[PDB]
RNA sequence: GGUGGCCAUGGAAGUCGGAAUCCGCUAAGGAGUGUGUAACAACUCACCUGCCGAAUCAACUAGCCCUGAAAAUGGAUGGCG
């Protein structure tokens, strides 16, 4: 259907990300603050939910 | 931790440098926990390996005790995953020989050393047609019944010669098992002699 | 096995823990011994007579696979002797009182039990696994006045003996 | 706290030739000749090694958030040097379920036609930046090949087509569609 | 590694949870940070190594700027700026 070594490419783009609690913005996996200056760059910050 | 630790580990290696004048460097790039398990339980009778860090480039301070003046040819080898093992009975070789079990094969493209690979001229056994391999470098294959043959045969790379990737992977489909020196031996030092492993110290 | 299924002298080894009495409740070894010409009830029922005469504590199953006969050995455990090294079997319904009540005192049969113990320490001389199998407790907990909170620190016998 | 002086030096290789108009730095190797203006970054560009060995930047007195734009300077010239030496390449996959994505080139480059991602009408047109050869590659199924010498220049083209190849009210975590960079690396290797 | 350790079996062999609970190989591996897996595995993290050459790390505290910060005729540091 989609062979793995390019679904774990994908999902490098669209799925292994932190999104901040706050304003919901997407960042990379790295991230403990945030970019937004809406938020105020908060670190509340939480994984993007893996899909089941 | 590692305040007074530190401190005891060494007093242990400044030990097995004057009691044991017999040293042999390995080296264990590719290892397992259990693996080690098993390699002290196959010499207890022989042999004490002694595993360290960056601080075994501390020769200097048993060497800074004003005695001993011939470890400085064991600077140089301190570097690159380099652990020791002093031996009390070791009289030659006639150990070294017996602790070489099975361990590397598996050819990585990118080396050089041992010397020219040859491919005899047998039947590979491996499935139908398959030849994608020896068409891509080219060599005198044929169909006998079911299994491939190799109805010729030359030296496939020589000393000196990288080896690329598709005729590295090659090799290990035919479990021809070449390229490798890893967790063997070294270096060794016997009354601060210098060693080589260009076959004559064996 | 190697290339077109062909058996060759079956000798292969499988193993199993958790033994009642034997079990049947429409289950045991399957998804291994249902290929490879053992059964569910016969093989199951002969596990019994061989893993019993006071075996019924959880235990530890190997059993040798021939054409379709299953040897069941119980090889014994590091923790389930100290567990038979107990005072000996309250079984199952009223017991009651579940498994921590602990004091056997397992004096020279430690010793016995770190014999028994094959190939399977990679060991010391026996004075360091007579501490190995000795902290290794939540039942017991020493010889018969002690605490195996001391029995780490010193040991004084049996050292020179089992070399 | 200003600190009073940070500088850093390039390593020029032989095969090229920097020669600086004040603070734009013009590079000229084999491939071809990159460009580009610092005039807004306040440094100093040195020749001071010889033959030509050392672009050395300094900044002077300055601060936290200016002593940083030290280093950036001096990663922008080794880029342009690999380059001019090399030429970038950077190599994209394309992924998806069902429908086939369906690429083809249509001046040199320039234009990159995407046919049938998720099954759309809509065909959708790229453009390439100047200088960006875009190149259906081989070797392999499903697989572009952007080339050419600025950085800047390949990986925002290669951007303008992994941004085009998006999915609108779905659940992109189970939409795994689209063309997307798989290998940065270089045309010679060296 | 001793190790399907013990409790818990509904599965927890390190890992829903808890009493805990230390040795061997030690270089170093917590009877385990988690990913997850019915459980593993597989992966990973502590811990320790291989490479590099000198400053690095953590918790607090305050100054300024940002976030918190939404109202209705257009709009007010007095204005320009
Ligand atoms: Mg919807
Ligand atoms: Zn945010």
Known sequence: IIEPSLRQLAQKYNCDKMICRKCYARLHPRAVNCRKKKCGHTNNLRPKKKVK | DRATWKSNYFLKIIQLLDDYPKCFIVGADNVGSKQMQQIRMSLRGKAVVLMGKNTMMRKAIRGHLENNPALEKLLPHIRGNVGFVFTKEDLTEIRDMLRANKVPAAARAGAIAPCEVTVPAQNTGLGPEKTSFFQALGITTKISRGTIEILSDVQLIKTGDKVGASEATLLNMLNISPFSFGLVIQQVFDNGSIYNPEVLDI | ?163 | MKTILSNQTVDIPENVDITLKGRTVIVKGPRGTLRRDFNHINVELSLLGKKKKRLRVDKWWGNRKELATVRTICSHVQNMIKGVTLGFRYKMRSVYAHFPINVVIQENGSLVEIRNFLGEKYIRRVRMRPGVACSVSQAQKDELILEGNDIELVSNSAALIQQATTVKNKDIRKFLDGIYVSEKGTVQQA
């Open chain 3, 1 to 163: 096995m190697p290339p077109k299924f062909d058996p060759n002298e079956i000798k292969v080894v499988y193993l199993r823990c958790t033994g009642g009495e034997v079990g049947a409740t429409s289950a045991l070894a399957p998804k291994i011994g249902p290929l490879g010409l053992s059964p569910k009830k016969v093989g199951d029922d002969i596990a019994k007579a061989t893993g019993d005469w006071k075996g019924l504590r959880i235990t530890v199953k190997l059993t040798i696979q021939n054409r379709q006969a299953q040897i069941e050995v119980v090889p014994s455990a590091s923790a389930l002797i100290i567990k038979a090294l107990k005072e000996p079997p309250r079984d199952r319904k009223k017991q009651k009182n579940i498994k921590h009540s602990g004091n056997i005192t397992f004096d020279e049969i430690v010793n016995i039990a770190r014999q028994m113990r094959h190939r399977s320490l990679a060991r010391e001389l026996s004075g360091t696994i007579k501490e190995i199998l000795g902290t290794a407790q939540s039942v017991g907990c020493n010889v018969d006045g002690r605490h195996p909170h001391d029995i780490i620190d010193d040991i004084n016998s049996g050292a020179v003996e089992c070399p």
